[PDB]
Amino acid sequence: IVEGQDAEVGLSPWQVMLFRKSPQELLCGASLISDRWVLTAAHCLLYPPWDKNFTVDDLLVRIGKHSRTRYERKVEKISMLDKIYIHPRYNWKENLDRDIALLKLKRPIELSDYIHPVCLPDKQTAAKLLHAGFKGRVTGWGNRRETWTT
Amino acid sequence: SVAEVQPSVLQVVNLPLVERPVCKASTRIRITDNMFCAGYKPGEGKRGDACEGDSGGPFVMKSPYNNRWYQMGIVSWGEGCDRDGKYGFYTHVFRLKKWIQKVIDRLGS
């Protein structure tokens, strides 16, 4: 995030972290929309142009975190994936159209103060809130600036 | 652990929904009804954007109707981070909602 600020703990309880089993590394963010399903972008998994194709056994999902680095023993849950579904019409060659994927957890996560699902919009919520000018929020552990660096 | 450029903790930014014709005009890329753009316009002074590593994260809104958070988007792509005249592109969740319910309601819904 550019020009963001530190979140309060429990600020975004649906914030999931996508992590590589090996080599160990942070891949992307994603969200918990259920006790069992995580939503993320297809390109976080499948992107041929960069020779990127992750399968279920290459990843873990870390839920309940604040710190990017340390293993937050008390609060965070670590899970493995059952299944993986990428939109059949996902387009990586022209515009990244339908950049969406669903992640099915091995077994349902245990909810808490720090782990709660966000809601998915209905028709009416969509009509009332999707208006030029209205603000929404973004969270992540992404870079604080444009890369010329690490 | 950390080091500048990479946060040590979760970051937050609130950004406005930009009108479609503006988004469409800000890029040479082929925009679709399946994505929306958000971010501050140059004539606004406030800044902020998603950046490399934010991909897959949520773009949420809080309903003033019922006080719940809704996920409206997913960080997709952009052209650099926080560049004047450019916007961040997000997957349009409500529009891909049918597919979401198809796969969760076991390939039927």
């Binding site: 990586w92 060659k93 | 890329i29 991909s55 952009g78």
Partner: peptide, 10 residues
């Protein structure tokens, strides 16, 4: 080509 035209995956 998304790439040829400047597009960056995040």
């Amino acid at each position: 080509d998304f790439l040829a035209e400047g597009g960056g995956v995040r």
